[PDB]
Scaffold this active site. Structure first.
Site, PDB file in Angstrom:
ATOM      1  N   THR C   1       0.846  -1.232   0.000  1.00  0.00           N
ATOM      2  CA  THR C   1       0.000   0.000   0.000  1.00  0.00           C
ATOM      3  C   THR C   1       0.864   1.259   0.000  1.00  0.00           C
ATOM      4  OG1 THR C   1      -1.954  -0.991   1.057  1.00  0.00           O
ATOM      5  CG2 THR C   1      -1.662   1.382   1.347  1.00  0.00           C
ATOM      6  N   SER C   2       0.446   2.241  -0.791  1.00  0.00           N
ATOM      7  CA  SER C   2       1.069   3.558  -0.813  1.00  0.00           C
ATOM      8  C   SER C   2      -0.027   4.604  -0.689  1.00  0.00           C
ATOM      9  CB  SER C   2       1.841   3.763  -2.113  1.00  0.00           C
ATOM     10  OG  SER C   2       2.873   2.803  -2.239  1.00  0.00           O
ATOM     11  N   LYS C  33      -8.947   2.885  -1.426  1.00  0.00           N
ATOM     12  CA  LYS C  33      -8.387   3.049  -0.084  1.00  0.00           C
ATOM     13  C   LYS C  33      -8.686   4.430   0.500  1.00  0.00           C
ATOM     14  CE  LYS C  33      -4.662  -0.079  -1.390  1.00  0.00           C
ATOM     15  NZ  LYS C  33      -3.211  -0.381  -1.286  1.00  0.00           N
TER      16      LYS C  33
END
Ligand SMILES: [Mg+2]
Ligand SMILES: [Mg+2]
Ligand SMILES: [Mg+2]
Ligand SMILES: [Mg+2]
Ligand SMILES: [Mg+2]
Ligand SMILES: [Mg+2]
EC number: 3.4.25.1
Lengths: 222, 212, 196, 195, 226, 204, 125, 233, 195, 196
Positions: C1-2, C33
């Site tokens: 995840t970023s 997200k």
């Protein structure tokens, strides 16, 4: 994993005289190889002519002493300001310790004072509350260094009268407060030399019928 | 530790050593392993020192409450069962106890109950508990008779602790003797093992292996 | 995840990749997200999907009930509710949440709440596995009071690099713009951001 | 504890139980009676973890004696065995289970039949002509399989029991200090004082 | 243990405390931790005491043979290379942590060596349980172009910081000064700030106090003539 | 489990005026079980005395090893080995077993025959030399011995006074250790006479 | 390859002579004179520095060698054989003595070790 | 039982003639990552007390809220809240010490080491330590974590015992603290250059200094250091 | 194996060794002789791990018999015990140590003295008036400490040995199936066939 | 540790921080991680200090013996010797080495050898714990055929960020310049690079 216990070092020594009692302890407080404090009082006047020290893990030691001092206060409230006798204090401390049988106070407790006949008294406790009246008891880090010396110099163990050659023991003559303090100081001076956790200062509490008196002595700071 | 107790014609003999150790370190030589529950009942202390002290003192309180309510001396059976039922509630928690509950009543006569932290409760004539129990058993088994005199029985219990004190590294210091009668227990003194060993060696001719 | 959130002149913008992995398998390549807890209070989620969804849903409930009684909540209040849940249940949660919101009084604000449950108010925040690779880039390139277009470029370039190096990150770059004007969703595809 | 045996013959049930009580290194007793009378015509022997055995046996005894007084009636061996099984079945999913295995030897006064029930600590009940717990069966069952007859007398049952005990005394590593033997029949429960 | 090394104008100085311990018990109150590898190459050791002494004697022995073989005075870099390659081979199982210092025809040198075989260069170094206390002093007072007198002062002050504040260190300060174009001067017990005070009592026993069973003469002499 | 405390026992050595003393208990055990009250832990090779505590099989083995080595030494050197030299031999011999050591606590004591200087030394199981002026201690009651020696010891004691000091140090230390005692021996060593004394102590 | 000379090259002749030892002594006889004198408070050893060429620096060629701090050696005969013996003598003083006893060997024992090395070259393969 | 996540390093402190000094850097580390550079770890309570906290930052923020709540609660029904019945350092410490020991006793500690620095009503210096185990102690100098190993030795050279306190001025004490912070920056891998310093004086009151930096650093000697032994270039 | 005892009296050494061989669940043999004659006047009993015991005992036997033939001379009990100790001391630091404890009872024909040596698997040798291995000493040493005299006859030694065995048979949990007793004196080695 | 090597127009430059830690204690704050295996073949060391020193010393020996026989070795040859040691002893080594050198024929070359013992020829390489934080920055800012001054700035800025975020990195920034002109050492102090 979280470890709720720790070792704050220190060494304590209780000796019961004929009409007096002393409870001594070094003033050094440590963790691992570091010194926390060169002067952190370890032996406490708890009132009613009783002195106490709970050596080992200092947080449990402070907690226990605090709870016992509290017990003395409430003993006065509940029983018409009656004096808590040393034997009654000892039994009370057993219940405080055994109360935490399955999560113990990680300390070796010693109290000192006078019994109801005015004679010198010292009581010694394990971490979970098994206790006993004793004439002589060292506790803590350098206990193994001090007790054999006390067996020899207080109780005259393995000492016999010259000429008889093992047939007649050296008689158990009573020691004065000045004589006991010499043995206490020499015990801690020797313990300081050979144990790294012992040093900085020595604080002695002397209990007599007149009350509680304090004496302080310097120890080596290395 | 070495503790024993045996039934005989004159009642019960209880004998114990006095040593307490933390590993190899001898913590004390003046430890009391006979708990005076009350003037009629005795208990021995092996395993956990606190557990034995605490709960056998507590047992005395329960025995006192019993005879206040029932106006009658508690039986050794009932007293022992109060303790065994208590420790059984704690089973698994880690209590460490091996004791002989000793007494002499009218209805029972001299009675000994071995009580355990596993919940075991055994009535018997001879019991030995502790790290030096095997040594004491040998002297007891070979010399025991029901028709022993109070004098000889006291010596047998003393000699059996001495045997264990000598061989067992974790037993020694001194010997505490008790004689339990119907009218209550009678203390028969503290006997230093150091002085007792040489005394017994000479008078008895035993311990020829040891140079004195 | 970023994931990241960046304050700028007109407010704040939230940014995120769309990759969700189970080990090395990409379970979802078009994940969202960027989640809404209030009209103009959103958050970026990293860590356990179950945990962060459960937390976000509870926060949304709390802010809805707050709004019924006391009117619109501040971004600080939303961050406090997130913190309370994350801190008090730290033993049973794996959640790293960035909270971003727009007031008219306070304008754009960003709060980051890492694993421990602490709160940190910042001009911008980065988080998730891919954030490690862009600490240098973001620190060098961030300026305060950027324009909307500059902030979009900053986030796009930053997450592009995070995606490039982090195998756990990827897919599309989603963004949500929070200003006085309203709420604007943006999306940027691989063919756009990979050539940057 | 160690060895407990049971055999149901024509008109009685015979239970044999070892006398030894060992606490690790030493044999503390060589005359221990590992049994409790639940009712005039129902006997239960037991073996398992220390403390649990006697605690369980006495708890069952108290409950059956309570039932006997309340109803002024003796429960059938089958009814007693079902009660005991349920207690053990309840126990196995408890915080700390009773680690106790039992044999229930009873004489049913209604049916005029001896009955032997074997129940382990899990609550596994079986009615058998002869039974055992632990390793006892490994040594004895081949002898019982060979010699047993349902029409055996009490005296023949005791002889077959002696042969089982002799085989145990020969091949078992542990010294169990002999056995106490008890007979359950129409007249009640009695102990064979010479064995 | 507290050990330090300090570079100065025309050479290098090393110093050490004198306490050796077994857990919390003080075995020797005046241990000699400054070891000689060669006349003008000295080292101080921390960690496993047997390993430090053993590894310095071995390398010192091979250094002497190497010096004789090459007809040249031994170099610190040779001691360093031989120590590190030995220690690396044993993968840290030889628990020797050393500060190596000395002078040779190349000049004055100061190195540290860790048990796994890594080495470091520096103007000031500290090792052992009291290294953090010592390094605090060194970081506070060290400067470039120290004199001989300033370096001895700094080194011994750094050891003192360990002596007082570290429980693993105590007693006295040993110092060795290695200056270029001079004999190395070993200063055993350079400072003595921890002398035990006179006891309150004499514990000399009366003769015949101990109980005795048997006496006998022991024959230490050889088998006699006639 | 711990090899250095299976068999138990202690050794102590002290220096005096123109003399040294070395002493040991006589116990050998299997943990709690007392096995022998005649297991002496002090040995001598010429005028050099060696005490050894720890695992009893290694005590025996090392004694036999140093007898072996000091006998060959004497044949080649044409003289008895000295305490200073023997100390280095003990150290070398222990360290050669660095990664498979003898579980022992040796103690050397003696007087140099040429200089007349009293000498004592101690070692850890791996060969590290402790060369103390005052006293050396070893065994399962080493803490107790450190405590006793530190308080009882004073320098330049005469042989018959040193005997009392070392005896009382050993006895009272052993009485606070479960795995030590069962008798004791004290060697009083002078330049050309050695007296050996068995002490009377409690047998528990 | 391999050293296939695993047999003695020095052997007893019918007359009981060990030829190679005698011939080695003959080589020593041809060698330059060296001497040793023992005093009450010291010992002196001396020899001639027979320079092979005047261009050669005879200081670099050491005929007298330190073996230990208290032991020295000089020779007569083949120089190269001496040089290697000095190397072996220096090492053996450490390996078979100093690393064991923590002190340098006495003269007689170091001599004994050197003698052993020379004996082995008289019997080995 | 937990593990610390976002952490703060050393807190250092000492007594001087008229009061106490306490200091701590502005870093919130995330393992080896130097994550947060603007974290204030000295939290003043009133005008007579400064609580310095190291260890877990989420727990520090919780403790910060407890102290804020303590001031509010003390003011309730208290006309002398800003006078005789104001919060003392000793009250604040004893409260925290109680909480810390209670939390360790429930096997759910506040993962911190705390130093409460302040001046009492009678002008006495207050300086006492408490940590996640509920262990407490007092000393003329106190320090947490790496500070205990490196700062204390330096601070103890100024005030080695109780009798040195009246001889130590605020300028000498502050100088020693600032130097100790530099030493920690050289040698602690989890430290930062930026720090805060607080002085609580019985005459001049509470002086809180933010945005201080480690200065006068020695690095020039690094240029001469080459290789790890034999390398010359 | 289990119990091995030894007692040195006036003019002989007596070794008592159990007859049982147990492989876990079953007693495979009740007549096993746990001893080997090393020389005409030297007997060694042994107990420890299965296989290792007999392998070690026979290896020692072969070596002493080899020495006897080579020198035409019987080694003293002391010499044999020192040889055995060294083998065990060598063994303890081997890849797989001999897990064997031994008693060596011998009569020294030169000194005209009986000698008993106790050696454990570590190579821990002690000369004793009486000795044991394992748990055997725990039960028996208190009796031996009490009754033992150095001037005892062989018959008195056997009586004291019977008392030790009786105590073992009473208090030990394991059935060791009695003991084989052998006497070592000036005339050699003989077995007491009734015990 | 933060280390990198960057090729440019005139050759190659190696860069490194100077921090060596034992846990959280900085054992050496002025370490030289740029080590010489040949005149114009150097390396950057990361991982176990003992291992990388031991490897570098062995390589230097091999290249010295190579030079005695076959003349100056290529940078590729040096990288091969490093690889051979790292690959064959992978079970007992923790070494991450960047090899950089200057030939006249090949000019500046950079080879990176990670934990496994593989070899990767690159225009530039980054390694060590601190490298994680500058993957984004370095990828965005690197250009081929930079000038000496540009490459020095690139390395200085890159390691500045690595030092800023990585606690295991710090101290001074050392650099070594490899060109036809010779070998130039550079050093940059905290007061210089922290303000960038
Ligand atoms: Mg110190
Ligand atoms: Mg009850
Ligand atoms: Mg979850
Ligand atoms: Mg990707
Ligand atoms: Mg079943
Ligand atoms: Mg004993």
């Amino acid at each position: 994993q979280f470890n709720p216990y720790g070792d704050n070092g220190g060494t304590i020594l209780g000796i019961a005289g004929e009409d007096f009692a002393v409870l001594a302890g070094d003033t050094r407080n440590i963790t691992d190889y570091s010194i926390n404090s060169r002067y952190e009082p370890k032996v406490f006047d708890c009132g009613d002519n009783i002195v106490m020290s709970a050596n080992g893990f200092a947080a449990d030691g402070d907690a226990l002493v605090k709870r016992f001092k509290n017990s003395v206060k409430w003993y006065h409230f509940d029983h018409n300001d009656k004096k808590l006798s040393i034997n009654s204090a000892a039994r009370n401390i057993q219940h405080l310790l055994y109360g935490k049988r399955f999560f113990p106070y990680y300390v070796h407790t010693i109290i000192a004072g006078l019994d109801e006949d005015g004679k010198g008294a010292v009581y010694s406790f394990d971490p979970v509350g098994s206790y006993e009246r004793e004439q002589c008891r060292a506790g803590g880090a350098a206990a193994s260094l001090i007790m054999p010396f006390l067996d020899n110099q207080v109780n005259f163990k393995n000492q016999y009268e010259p000429g008889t050659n093992g047939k007649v023991k050296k008689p158990l003559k009573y020691l004065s407060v000045e004589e006991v303090i010499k043995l206490v100081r020499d015990s801690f001076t020797s313990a300081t030399e050979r144990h790294i956790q012992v040093g900085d200062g020595l604080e002695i509490l002397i209990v007599t019928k007149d009350g509680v008196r304090k004496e302080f002595y310097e120890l080596k700071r290395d | 530790t070495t503790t024993l107790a045996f039934r005989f014609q004159g009642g019960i003999i209880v004998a114990v050593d006095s040593r307490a150790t933390a590993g190899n370190w001898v913590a004390s030589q003046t430890v009391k392993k006979v708990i005076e529950i009350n003037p009629f009942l005795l208990g021995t202390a092996a395993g956990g020192a606190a557990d034995c002290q605490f709960w056998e003192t507590w047992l005395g309180s329960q025995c006192r409450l019993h005879e206040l309510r029932e106006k009658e001396r508690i039986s050794v059976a009932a007293a022992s069962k109060i303790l065994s039922n208590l420790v059984y509630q704690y089973k698994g928690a880690g209590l460490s106890m091996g004791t002989m509950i000793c007494g002499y009543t009218r209805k029972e006569g001299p009675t000994i109950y071995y009580v355990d932290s596993d919940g075991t409760r055994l009535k018997g004539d001879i019991f030995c508990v502790g790290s030096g129990q095997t040594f004491a058993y040998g002297v007891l088994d070979s010399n025991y008779k029901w028709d022993l005199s109070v004098e000889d029985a006291l010596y047998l219990g003393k000699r059996s602790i001495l045997a264990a004190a000598h061989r067992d590294a974790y037993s020694g210091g001194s010997v505490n003797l008790y004689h339990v009668t119907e009218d209550g227990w009678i203390y028969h003194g503290n006997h230093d093992v150091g002085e007792l060993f040489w005394k017994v060696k000479e008078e008895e001719g035993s311990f020829n292996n040891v140079i004195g | 995840t970023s994931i990241m959130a960046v304050t700028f002149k007109d407010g704040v913008i939230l940014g995120a990749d769309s990759r969700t992995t189970t080990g090395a398998y990409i379970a979802n390549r078009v994940t969202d997200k960027l989640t809404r807890v209030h009209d103009k209070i959103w958050c970026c989620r990293s860590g356990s999907a179950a945990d962060t969804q459960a937390i976000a849903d509870i926060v949304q409930y709390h802010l809805e009930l707050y709004t019924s009684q006391y009117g619109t909540p501040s971004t600080e209040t939303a961050a406090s509710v997130f913190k309370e849940l994350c801190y008090e249940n730290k033993d049973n949660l794996t959640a790293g949440i960035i909270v971003a919101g727009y007031d008219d009084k306070n304008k754009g604000e960003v709060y980051t709440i890492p694993l421990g449950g602490s709160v940190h108010k910042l001009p911008y925040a980065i988080a998730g596995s891919g954030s490690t690779f862009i600490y240098g880039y973001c620190d060098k390139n961030f300026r305060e009071n950027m324009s909307k277009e500059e902030t979009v470029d900053f986030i796009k370039h930053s997450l592009s690099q995070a995606i490039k190096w982090d195998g756990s990150s990827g897919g599309v770059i989603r963004m949500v713009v929070l200003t006085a004007a309203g709420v604007e969703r943006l999306i940027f595809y691989p063919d756009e951001y990979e050539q940057l | 504890m160690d060895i407990i045996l049971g055999i149901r013959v024509q008109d009685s049930v015979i239970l044999a139980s070892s006398k030894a009580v060992t606490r690790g290194i030493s044999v503390l007793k060589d005359s221990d009676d590992k049994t409790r009378q639940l009712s005039p015509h129902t006997l239960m022997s037991f073996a398992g973890e220390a403390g649990d055995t006697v605690q369980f046996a006495e708890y069952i005894q108290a409950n059956i004696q309570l039932y006997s007084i309340r109803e002024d009636y003796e429960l059938s061996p089958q009814a007693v065995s079902s009660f005991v099984r349920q207690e053990l079945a309840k126990s196995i999913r408890s915080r700390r289970p009773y680690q106790v295995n039992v044999l229930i030897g009873g004489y049913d006064k209604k049916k005029n039949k001896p009955e032997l029930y074997q129940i382990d600590y899990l609550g596994t009940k079986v009615e058998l002509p002869y039974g055992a717990h632990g390793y006892s069966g490994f040594y004895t069952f081949s002898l019982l399989d060979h010699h047993y007859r349902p029409d055996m007398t009490t005296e023949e049952g005791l002889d077959l029991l002696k042969l089982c005990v002799q085989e145990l005394e020969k091949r078992m590593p542990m010294d169990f200090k002999g056995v106490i033997v008890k007979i359950v029949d129409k007249d009640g429960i009695r102990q064979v004082d010479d064995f | 243990t507290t050990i330090v090394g300090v570079k100065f104008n025309n050479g290098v100085v090393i110093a050490a405390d004198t306490r050796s311990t077994q857990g919390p018990i003080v075995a020797d109150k005046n241990c000699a931790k400054l070891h000689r590898i060669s006349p003008k190459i000295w080292c101080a050791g921390a960690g496993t005491a047997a390993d430090t002494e053993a590894v310095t004697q071995l390398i010192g022995s091979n250094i002497e043979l190497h010096s004789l073989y090459t007809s040249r005075e031994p170099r610190v870099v040779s001691a360093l290379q031989m120590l590190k390659q030995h220690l690396f081979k044993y993968q840290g199982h030889i628990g020797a942590y050393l500060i190596v210092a000395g002078v040779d025809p190349t000049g004055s040198h100061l190195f540290s060596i860790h048990a796994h075989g890594s080495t470091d260069v520096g103007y000031y170094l500290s090792l052992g349980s009291g290294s953090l206390a010592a390094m605090a002093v060194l970081e506070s007072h060290w400067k470039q172009d120290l004199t001989k007198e300033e370096a001895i002062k700094l080194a011994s002050d750094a050891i003192q910081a360990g002596i007082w504040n570290d429980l693993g260190s105590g007693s006295n300060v040993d110092v060795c000064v290695m200056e270029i174009g001079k004999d190395a001067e070993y200063l055993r017990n350079y400072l003595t700030p921890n002398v035990r005070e006179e006891k309150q009592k004499s514990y000399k026993f009366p003769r015949g106090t101990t109980a005795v069973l048997k006496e006998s003469i022991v024959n230490i002499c050889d088998i006699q003539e006639e | 489990s711990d090899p250095s405390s299976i068999n138990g026992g202690i050794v102590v050595a002290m220096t005096g005026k123109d003399c040294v003393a070395i002493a040991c208990d006589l116990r050998l055990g299997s943990q709690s079980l007392g096995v022998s009250n005649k297991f002496e832990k002090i040995f001598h090779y010429g005028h050099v005395f060696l005490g050894i505590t720890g695992l009893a099989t290694d005590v025996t083995t090392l004694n036999e090893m140093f007898r072996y080595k000091t006998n060959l030494y004497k044949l080649k050197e044409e003289r008895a080995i000295e305490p200073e030299t023997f100390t280095q031999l003990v150290s070398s011999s222990l360290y050669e077993r660095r990664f498979g050591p003898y579980f022992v606590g040796p103690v050397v004591a003696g007087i140099n025959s040429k200089s007349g200087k009293p000498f004592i030394a101690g070692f850890d199981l791996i060969g590290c030399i402790d060369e103390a002026k005052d006293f050396i201690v070893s065994g399962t009651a080493s803490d107790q011995l450190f405590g006793m020696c530190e308080s009882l010891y004073e320098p330049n004691l005469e042989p018959e006074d040193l005997f009392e000091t070392i005896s009382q140090a050993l006895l009272n230390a052993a009485d606070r250790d479960a795995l030590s005692g069962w008798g004791a021996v004290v060697y009083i060593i002078k330049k050309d006479e050695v007296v050996k004394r068995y002490l009377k102590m409690r047998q528990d | 390859m391999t050293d296939r000379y695993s047999f003695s090259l020095t052997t007893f002749s019918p007359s009981g002579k060990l030829g190679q030892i005698d011939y080695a002594l003959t080589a020593v006889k041809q060698g330059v004179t060296s001497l040793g004198i023992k005093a009450t408070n010291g010992v002196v050893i001396a020899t001639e520095k027979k320079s092979s060429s005047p261009l050669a620096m005879s200081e670099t060629l050491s005929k007298v060698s330190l073996l230990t701090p208290d032991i020295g050696a000089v020779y007569s005969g083949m120089g190269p054989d001496y040089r290697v013996l000095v190397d072996k003598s220096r090492k053996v003083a450490h390996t078979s003595y100093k690393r064991i006893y923590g002190e340098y060997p006495p003269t007689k024992l170091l001599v004994s070790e050197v003698a052993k090395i020379m004996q082995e070259a008289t019997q080995s393969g | 039982t937990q593990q610390p996540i976002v952490t703060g390093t050393s807190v250092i402190s000492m007594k001087y003639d008229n009061g106490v000094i306490i200091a701590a850097d502005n870093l919130g580390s995330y393992g080896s990552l130097l994550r947060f550079n603007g974290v204030e770890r000295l939290i003043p309570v009133g005008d007579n007390t400064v609580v310095g906290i190291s260890g877990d930052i989420s727990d520090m923020q919780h403790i910060e809220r407890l102290l804020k709540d303590l001031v509010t609660e003390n003011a309730y029904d208290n006309p002398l809240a800003d006078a005789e019945e104001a919060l003392e350092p000793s009250y604040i410490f004893e409260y925290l010490a109680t909480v810390m020991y209670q939390r360790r006793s429930k096997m759910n500690p506040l993962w911190n080491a705390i130093i409460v620095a302040g001046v009492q009503s009678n002008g006495d210096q207050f300086l006492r330590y408490v940590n996640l185990l509920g262990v407490t102690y007092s000393s003329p100098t106190l320090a947490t974590g790496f500070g205990a190993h490196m700062a204390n030795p330096l601070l103890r050279k100024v005030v080695d015992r109780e009798s040195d306190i009246p001889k130590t001025t605020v300028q000498v004490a502050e100088e020693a603290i600032v130097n100790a912070m530099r030493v920690l920056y050289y040698r602690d891998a989890r430290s930062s250059r930026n720090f805060s310093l607080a002085i609580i004086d019985k005459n001049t009151g509470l002086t809180f200094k933010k945005n201080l930096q480690v200065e006068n650093m020695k690095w020039d000697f690094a240029k001469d250091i080459k290789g790890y032994g034999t390398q010359k270039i």
